[PDB]
């Protein structure tokens, strides 16, 4: 049921990332194309993120959803840890955003609709990974979204140190929707300290080209008090979503 690094042909690099790169790979026996994530135990141990990692790993392994990057397996050698992941051929949403500068309401709503589903599944399954950047959002063959696995995407309750629950996801959707439409996250600043202040105060403005249908949803998502954020079902049922989703 386990493996080795001898069973893979390593291709081009896909990203630098965190504690090691990710390579395009191919299982020799089956010719299965996949993404191989490499992480150094030593570099892992220096931040001690070994329990949290393997905890995160074991759970994702059993998760099955179109909008979540499949994890097939894992193993280690001596100096590093290998993750066998679903290969998303169309890259990250962040790059597409970089190329397209910004998204239309059609693509945005469709993305948000895809995400809201995934988080609902993630919530029901009682799994939590709270923070979602476009850097960790991947695209499938059909252009479908893929969730894989930093202050700008954190909710006020998290940076303040207060308690938090499933409502922090709603915040993320709000930040992403805005960024998708504008090309910049709402609370972007040239300073960590300034971003912090703006998240805690919820200081943001809409560019003129943003429709009041989108302003509404975003405004209702980016509430400081988590209790006043809508349920996920409400997002999917939102008129601006329905009108522009796919
Ligand atoms: C450290 C870490 O998590 N790196 C992750 C980022 C996305 N990533 C991918 C993962 Cl985990 C799986 N498949 C990918 N495909 C791509 C890609 C990027 N471009 C520009 N074109 C393609 C195709 N990236 C991935 C590796």
Q: Tell me how many strands there are.
A: 7
Please name the CATH architecture of the largest domain: Orthogonal Bundle
- Portion of residues within helices: 25-40%
Outline:
globular
Let me know the largest β-sheet.
Answer: 5 strands, antiparallel
Q: Which molecules other than protein and nucleic acid are bound?
A: the ligand CC(=O)N[C@H]1CCN(c2c(Cl)cnc3[nH]c(-c4cn(C)nc4C)nc23)C1
State which percent range the strand residues make up.
15-25%
- CATH H level of the largest domain: which superfamily? Transferase(Phosphotransferase) domain 1
Secondary-structure element sequence? EEEHHEEHHEEHHHHHH
* Largest sheet, spatial ordering of strands: 1-2-3-5-4
CATH topology of the largest domain: Transferase(Phosphotransferase), domain 1
Number of domains: 2
Question: Roughly how many Å is the radius of gyration?
Answer: 19 Å
Count of helical regions:
10
Distance between the termini: 40 Å
CATH top-level class of the largest domain = Mainly Alpha
The chain-level structural class is alpha+beta
